[PDB]
Amino acid sequence: VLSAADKSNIQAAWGKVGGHAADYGAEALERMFLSFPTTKTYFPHFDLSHGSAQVKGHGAKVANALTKAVGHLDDLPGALSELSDLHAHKLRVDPVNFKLLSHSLLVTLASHLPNDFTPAVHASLDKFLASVSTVLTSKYR
Amino acid sequence: VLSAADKSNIQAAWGKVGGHAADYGAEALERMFLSFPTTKTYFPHFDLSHGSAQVKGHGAKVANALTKAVGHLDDLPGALSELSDLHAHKLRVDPVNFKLLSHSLLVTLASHLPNDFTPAVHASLDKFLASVSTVLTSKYR
Amino acid sequence: MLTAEEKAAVTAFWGKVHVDEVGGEALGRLLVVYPWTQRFFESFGDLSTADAVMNNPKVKAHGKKVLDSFSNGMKHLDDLKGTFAALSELHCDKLHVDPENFKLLGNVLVVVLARHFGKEFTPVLQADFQKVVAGVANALAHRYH
Amino acid sequence: MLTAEEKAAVTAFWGKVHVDEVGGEALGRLLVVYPWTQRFFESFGDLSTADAVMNNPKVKAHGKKVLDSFSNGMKHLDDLKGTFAALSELHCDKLHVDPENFKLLGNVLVVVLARHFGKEFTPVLQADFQKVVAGVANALAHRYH
Ligand code: HEM
Ligand code: HEM
Ligand code: HEM
Ligand code: HEM
């Protein structure tokens, strides 16, 4: 449902991110956990302290998935098939927690891309993350 | 995306409305205005008291657009083309208000059709109203 | 925010509600309609389909307790925060339920009241109970504040 | 509900902030990213394009007044309810702004501060400011409760 205008804003932003993707994903996770303590209950098997190997590694996994998504903006339901099952059916992740991570991600991107994070680019990235969130919350019981 | 798995519940429940669509639309509007006062400010050209022909007439329009949506579940973006622009551009309706009208609509349907309003049909009408609301908020530029 | 008038009609109507039935159905409808809420009820056994959820005896036993708490709130409309302080502790600090779900369950309770009482659950009466569910949802979310 | 540690860190951070530069950006991004918010700002003139909004003289002056209210809030972190009492009356009783948008503007402000302050806006410090924005959004919504 995303516009061509949004897609090219998203593609350009993530292209700038480049090989920083995994580092920024780990950052976004830390900002989520510290800003929103409720989200920590999803990761009790994790050491959640700063610079932990598990948050680092999980940050890389999340960023990888967003790279995959950025490349399939015409078909997110199709491309995030296994992740939708994981998040909706198996893990039963509360949809508000997607808004929380989404916000964390935007904070991280703004922090690192201050020149390229225009109002227009901000709005397109918010729509992209809301669109991914919808797919990940689409296949519950 | 609305699931095709939901269509049979949607068409069955909504089919029970029938000649009551305009009375149920009006009721739902009234339940919205009374439970959620912030919604009244969209309608300062209305008398919003019980029995007002404006709420009656408007309740009919809402109901009738939902009826058309029920007959175009494969293409809700297309069916609601003109309503999309009106609500999102001219009217600037805050997305959260669609949730409040959607709740008001489920309350109305539960009261009037208690037997048709099963747990599964409830869930399908929730996804239907959430899909409708997505389309009507989709043109914000 | 409940006026004296809003209190008395809400209170008069409440006496009619069987809360064995209404509590079970509301908690069941929460789990069916918003299936992420099932995360918090692993230990309740089978929750796979609408029928399994609704007819689950743990779901019905737990829904009874939920509505027993609402019945308690109804008795203390001028002090919901103090009334639910123990439940806020549990839901927020022990269970970390996102507070948005407290509104959702309140809303579902309203739907169930409408289904059960139809004609009697008028627009005015429903409006009053929305103030109550708003009140309960906030009292429960207070430990986050 | 901040700790003494969080209160001191966030108040120290706020003092450094050039509000004039931040306020207008925050409100501009609000109007651009969440366009329905424009409903409340029709007296402000040209809001047609992103550059119109970002460069609108009234948007800039209003944003500064918004941040000034945060600056006051910063001095009364344990009485945000009283501090924002009249502003809650304006936003709820007169404007009827849905309270979800109080969170949205706070969140937009956080994003703007990150854009400006980069790695200095640390995960801890941003977390501290999120509790401030959560607290302020609640206090503004109080007239609804
Ligand atoms: C932008 C949205 C998100 C994306 C792209 C994403 C992506 C991923 C990926 C790639 C995995 C690993 C899957 C695998 O390789 O097996 C994963 C796992 C997981 N995710 Fe997410 N996720 C998102 C949102 C969330 C949210 C909001 C939460 C909860 C706060 C969450 C909780 C989890 C949990 C608990 C796991 C399992 C990790 C483990 O057991 O080691 N996810 N996610
Ligand atoms: C399920 C979602 C909704 C549907 C199906 C719907 C349907 C309609 C229809 C058919 C019209 C008349 C269009 C015309 O004259 O061309 C209309 C107008 C209007 N709608 Fe909605 N609407 C929805 C949600 C909302 C919400 C949530 C609000 C605000 C609380 C709202 C506010 C208005 C207003 C202010 C008008 C014009 C009023 C008038 O002059 O009669 N709508 N809507
Ligand atoms: C209006 C909102 C709610 C009320 C009044 C309420 C009430 C209650 C009551 C009475 C108990 C039993 C505590 C005891 O007597 O020992 C309880 C426990 C519990 N609540 Fe709620 N509740 C609400 C919302 C929620 C929501 C939305 C969820 C999650 C989606 C939730 C999850 C739980 C869980 C997991 C337990 C413990 C269950 C067990 O393992 O025994 N509650 N609550
Ligand atoms: C963090 C949340 C918010 C804060 C701290 C805040 C702060 C303020 C303050 C301090 C004023 C008074 C300025 C003066 O006295 O001149 C004001 C006015 C106003 N606010 Fe907000 N506000 C918030 C959220 C919002 C939102 C979300 C909207 C709209 C969607 C909004 C719409 C308005 C409007 C229309 C005015 C009057 C503007 C005028 O005509 O001069 N506010 N706000």
Structural domains of chain A sorted by starting position, each given as residue range(s) with its CATH number in brackets: 1-141 (1.10.490.10)
Tokens of residue C135, six digits: 């009140």
Kindly list the residues of chain B whose beta carbon comes within 8 Å of any beta carbon in chain A.
1, 77, 134, 138
State the Cα–Cα distance between residues A6 and A12, nearest whole angstrom: 10
CB-based burial, D44-73: b 16+ in 10 Å, e otherwise: beebeebeebbebeebbebbbebbeebeeb
A positions 43-72 inside 8 Å of C (CB): none
C134 touching chain D per CB within 8 A = yes
**Pick from C111, C123, C127: CB nearest B27:** C123
Q: Are A106 and A126 in contact (CB under 8 A)?
A: yes
Distance of CA C39 to the CA centre of its chain: 18
**Position B25, amino acid:** G
Residue C2, class by beta-carbon neighbours within 10 Å (0-12 exposed, 13-18 middle, 19+ buried)? middle
**Pick from B35, B117, B120: CB nearest C127:** B35
Angle among Cα C23, C26, C32 to the nearest 5 degrees reads 140
Query: Which residues, at least 6 apart from B55, have a Cβ–Cβ distance to it below 8 Å?
Result: B26, B29, B30, B33, B46, B47, B48
Residue D112 C-alpha to ligand 4 middle, in angstroms? 17
Identify all chain A residues contacting C35, using CB atoms and an 8 Å cutoff. Answer: 88, 92, 140-141
CB count, 10 Å around CB of C51?
Answer: 13
Query: Which residues, at least 6 apart from D41, have a Cβ–Cβ distance to it below 8 Å?
Result: D31, D47, D59, D62
State the Cα–Cα distance between residues D97 and D101, nearest whole angstrom: 7
Residue A116, class by beta-carbon neighbours within 10 Å (0-12 exposed, 13-18 middle, 19+ buried)? middle
State the Cα–Cα distance between residues B123 and C27, nearest whole angstrom: 14
Query: Which residues, at least 6 apart from B59, have a Cβ–Cβ distance to it below 8 Å?
Result: B22, B23, B24, B25, B26, B27, B28, B29, B30
Task: With CA atoms as reference, report the closest residue to B94 among B25, B54, B140, B63.
Answer: B140
- Annotated binding site of C for heme b, which residues? 62, 91
Identify all chain C residues contacting A95, using CB atoms and an 8 Å cutoff. Answer: 36
Please report the DSSP string for D15-53 in residue order.
Answer: HH--HHHHHHHHHHHHHHHSGGGGGG-GGG---SSHHHH
Q: What is the DSSP letter of B48?
A: -
Give just the sign of the alpha carbon dihedral D105, D111, D117, D121: positive
B37 touching chain D per CB within 8 A = yes
Query: Which residues, at least 6 apart from D110, have a Cβ–Cβ distance to it below 8 Å?
Result: A103, A107, D126, D129, D130, D133
> Left (φ > 0), alpha (ψ -120 to 50) or beta: where does B134 sit?
alpha
State the Cα–Cα distance between residues B22 and B19, nearest whole angstrom: 8
Q: What is the DSSP letter of D90?
A: I
**Resolution reading in Å:** 2.0
CB count, 10 Å around CB of C124?
Answer: 15
State the Cα–Cα distance between residues C120 and C143, nearest whole angstrom: 35
Residue tagged 């976004």 (tokens): A28
Q: What is the DSSP letter of C15?
A: T
Q: From the CA atom positions of chain D, what is the Rg in Å? A: 15
Closest residue in chain C to residue D132, using alpha carbons only: C145
Specify the number of domains making up chain C.
1
- The approach used to solve this structure was X-ray
User: Chain B closest CA to C140's CA: distance in Å?
Assistant: 20
State the Cα–Cα distance between residues C88 and C138, nearest whole angstrom: 9
Q: Are B32 and B100 in contact (CB under 8 A)?
A: yes
Tokens of residue C122, six digits: 């008028």
Please report the DSSP string for B102-139 in residue order.
Answer: HHHHHHHHHHH-TTT--HHHHHHHHHHHHHHHHHHTS-
Q: Which domain holds residue C50?
A: 1-145
Which atom of ligand 1 is nearest the CA belonging to A54?
41
User: Chain B closest CA to A8's CA: distance in Å?
Assistant: 15
CB count, 10 Å around CB of A52?
Answer: 14
> Which CATH number do you get for residue C46?
1.10.490.10
Task: With CA atoms as reference, report the closest residue to D64 among D96, D109, D107.
Answer: D109
Task: With CA atoms as reference, report the closest residue to C56 among C72, C69, C38, C68.
Answer: C38
